[PDB]
Design a protein around this ligand. Structure first.
Ligand SMILES: C[C@@H]1O[C@@H](O[C@@H]2[C@@H](O[C@H]3O[C@H](CO)[C@H](O)[C@H](O)[C@H]3O)[C@@H](O)[C@@H](CO)O[C@@H]2O)[C@@H](O)[C@H](O)[C@@H]1O
Ligand SMILES: C[C@@H]1O[C@@H](O[C@@H]2[C@@H](O[C@H]3O[C@H](CO)[C@H](O)[C@H](O)[C@H]3O)[C@@H](O)[C@@H](CO)O[C@@H]2O)[C@@H](O)[C@H](O)[C@@H]1O
Ligand SMILES: C[C@@H]1O[C@@H](O[C@@H]2[C@@H](O[C@H]3O[C@H](CO)[C@H](O)[C@H](O)[C@H]3O)[C@@H](O)[C@@H](CO)O[C@H]2O)[C@@H](O)[C@H](O)[C@@H]1O
Ligand SMILES: C[C@@H]1O[C@@H](O[C@@H]2[C@@H](O[C@H]3O[C@H](CO)[C@H](O)[C@H](O)[C@H]3O)[C@@H](O)[C@@H](CO)O[C@H]2O)[C@@H](O)[C@H](O)[C@@H]1O
Ligand SMILES: C[C@@H]1O[C@@H](O[C@@H]2[C@@H](O[C@H]3O[C@H](CO)[C@H](O)[C@H](O)[C@H]3O)[C@@H](O)[C@@H](CO)O[C@H]2O)[C@@H](O)[C@H](O)[C@@H]1O
Ligand SMILES: C[C@@H]1O[C@@H](O[C@@H]2[C@@H](O[C@H]3O[C@H](CO)[C@H](O)[C@H](O)[C@H]3O)[C@@H](O)[C@@H](CO)O[C@H]2O)[C@@H](O)[C@H](O)[C@@H]1O
Ligand SMILES: [Ca+2]
Ligand SMILES: [Ca+2]
Ligand SMILES: [Ca+2]
Ligand SMILES: [Ca+2]
Ligand code: NA
Ligand code: NA
Lengths: 292, 292
């Protein structure tokens, strides 16, 4: 089954993503095909998939920016029926907003079936245009039709995935303890991570003994990413990935506080130095504590 | 010996504190007697005492606000010599800024002797006026003269004192681990702690599942106290006390993140709820992790 998480949903036939037009929270805002930039935040094109209990392979899809739900208009089974953003809730019984999401016949892309209508999310005519209609359409689970096939490009990690990435890092002290704060995290491109750092005001902060030293920089950077999360997204039920670590050098006579993020493939952590905005595979310390 | 730490220095004869006039960083700013309010930050009346290596019971005294040092003018041994704020460094060899500080004959108050002149810090005539002259004056270590006797009212804790306060709290989980970030901390009155909370903007923050929940509130409050430290004080070599704790309820099926501060007597911790600005002796959780 598709994991709970945040997805960038990309048509299998043409490089168009599922896009809530202008990110509007208005009821009945069109959901359309739109081009995208890899290794960015695609602000209108992120979807939180929430599994429904006691309904196999069935989800709500909440737009991360608008906090509104992918909705088949009046649940109609007519081919060409509008797919829109609409107000709802994560565990609604409204079948207009319930979507069965299972692998296509190519074993990699998915099809997205409305739970009520049993019709499929369809990029009409495979139109690659920006603002191309997406509709509910007749189809089958097994057919090759790329209009109705969608890559779910996973943008989030579970706490368990983050814990795995840390555990397979070689720069962890024997005495390490990790403290998990949330359940599901949006992984930032370094470009975005860096922009939050710049916007924090840390780049202009002076290192001062105890009163604003490494621990103040690291905790300030985490607070700044936390604030950016709440201020940026209207959806709930996830966090933004930004770690704090305390580390000790090899000689065991110097400690340091710093941040860490995750690679694009979600497999490994990268250390961030909030003094100078550097990314390092080796920051010259072994982490004895992390919270994230 | 007097501990390294931050002190509010209060005359034994009249309720006047040692005050750097208008907190000015200007060289030659008068240091004067001035009245004070207990359980506040007395902005111009806090002094960081830094022990000198290989000189017994001898210190620099740095004004926490100005970052300038208590200085006997031209190191003169003449009675009535000005005591001023002056630019210097924590481990200076300038005897104008070096002060031997040992218990008076009453065993509770101290006398403050210039290391160069061997004359004593004197509230001239015991004048209780706001802006009364403080000078270097002839005297002895043993005499009762209250003009030259000074209570060192300790405003800071060592990391060891903070660790003791946590350890004698009854709301600590069996699995607790504590992570120490700095060495010496200014303890805030609750009135000040509360004001930093209000000024953070947290009072108007909405609790949102994962994206701005208890851990975001607690880390935001710590960052806010860290920022207030750096922005408020020009001295270095200390931090502001504000803790983060993670806790678990008695049933072991609910966790919470929150802050903690220290009592006026520095002996115990008090829990702070950054959701609503409440202080609690029991927040209904046992702490399994803290960083401070
Ligand atoms: C190029 C075209 O592809 C397929 O048609 C699609 C449509 O496919 C879907 O709807 C049709 C009925 O209209 C049928 O139910 C099919 O099984 C289902 O996948 C649909 O995707 C529309 C809207 O984008 O575009 C095309 O018309 C195929 O059936 C056609 O023969 C033809 O090869
Ligand atoms: C009331 C007064 O108290 C004492 O005199 C102090 C001064 O005391 C100090 O200086 C004197 C010499 O002027 C002497 O060296 C003494 O041992 C030393 O403590 C001084 O504090 C000034 C400035 O505030 O005020 C008083 O004059 C005492 O010696 C006097 O006899 C008298 O009791
Ligand atoms: C918030 C906004 O984001 C961008 O504009 C969006 C646009 O974003 C996508 O398409 C553009 C080209 O139009 C790029 O490929 C981006 O990488 C995509 O994410 C669409 O989502 C449309 C339709 O909803 O809305 C626009 O606001 C960007 O161009 C803006 O400057 C701005 O940052
Ligand atoms: C059958 C119908 O179901 C609900 O109305 C849906 C509507 O539902 C959502 O939005 C409305 C406000 O328009 C309410 O907030 C619901 O709580 C939401 O779930 C949308 O799905 C639209 C667009 O497809 O269709 C309506 O039929 C319900 O509110 C109605 O009373 C009625 O039961
Ligand atoms: C920063 C400033 O602090 C207060 O004024 C100081 C003053 O503070 C002390 O004396 C006042 C009465 O004048 C109260 O007792 C305070 O509790 C004391 O801390 C002195 O330090 C003088 C001399 O240096 O400077 C003033 O600025 C306060 O009254 C101001 O509103 C302001 O907050
Ligand atoms: C003997 C004298 O000592 C120093 O001058 C002090 C002076 O020292 C401090 O302030 C000056 C600037 O005025 C420098 O930054 C020093 O580094 C500071 O330690 C003050 O103590 C004043 C007031 O009592 O007295 C001067 O004598 C030194 O700079 C001189 O060259 C000279 O060696
Ligand atoms: Ca949480
Ligand atoms: Ca610090
Ligand atoms: Ca530190
Ligand atoms: Ca959180
Ligand atoms: Na399910
Ligand atoms: Na010493």
């Amino acid at each position: 089954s598709l994991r709970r998480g945040i997805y960038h949903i990309e048509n299998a036939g043409v490089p168009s993503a599922i896009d809530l037009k202008d990110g509007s929270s208005s009821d009945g805002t069109p959901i359309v095909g739109w081009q995208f930039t890899p290794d960015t935040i695609n602000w209108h094109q992120l979807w939180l998939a929430e599994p429904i209990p006691n309904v196999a392979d069935t989800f709500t899809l909440c737009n991360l920016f608008s906090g509104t739900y992918m909705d088949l208009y009046n649940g109609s089974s007519e081919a060409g029926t509008a797919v829109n953003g609409w107000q709802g809730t994560a565990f609604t019984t409204n079948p207009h907003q319930l979507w069965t999401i299972k692998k296509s016949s190519d074993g990699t892309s998915y099809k997205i079936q409305n739970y009520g209508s049993k019709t499929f999310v369809d990029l009409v005519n495979g139109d690659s245009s920006d603002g191309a209609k997406i509709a509910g359409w007749t189809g089958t689970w097994d057919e090759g039709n790329p209009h109705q096939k969608w890559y779910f490009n996973r943008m989030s990690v579970s706490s368990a995935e983050a814990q795995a990435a840390i555990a397979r890092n070689p720069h962890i002290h024997g005495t390490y303890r990790g403290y998990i704060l949330d359940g599901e995290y949006l992984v930032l491109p370094n470009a975005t991570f860096t922009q939050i750092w710049k916007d924090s005001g840390l780049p202009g902060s002076k290192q001062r003994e105890q009163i604003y030293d490494c621990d103040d920089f690291a905790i300030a950077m985490k607070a700044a990413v936390g604030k950016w999360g709440a201020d940026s997204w209207k959806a709930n039920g996830f966090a933004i990935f930004c770690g704090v670590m305390l580390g000790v050098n090899k000689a065991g006579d110097a400690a340091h506080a710093y941040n860490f993020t995750l690679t694009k493939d979600h497999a490994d952590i990268v250390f961030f130095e909030p003094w100078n905005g550097g990314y390092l595979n080796d920051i010259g310390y072994d982490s004895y504590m992390a919270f994230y």
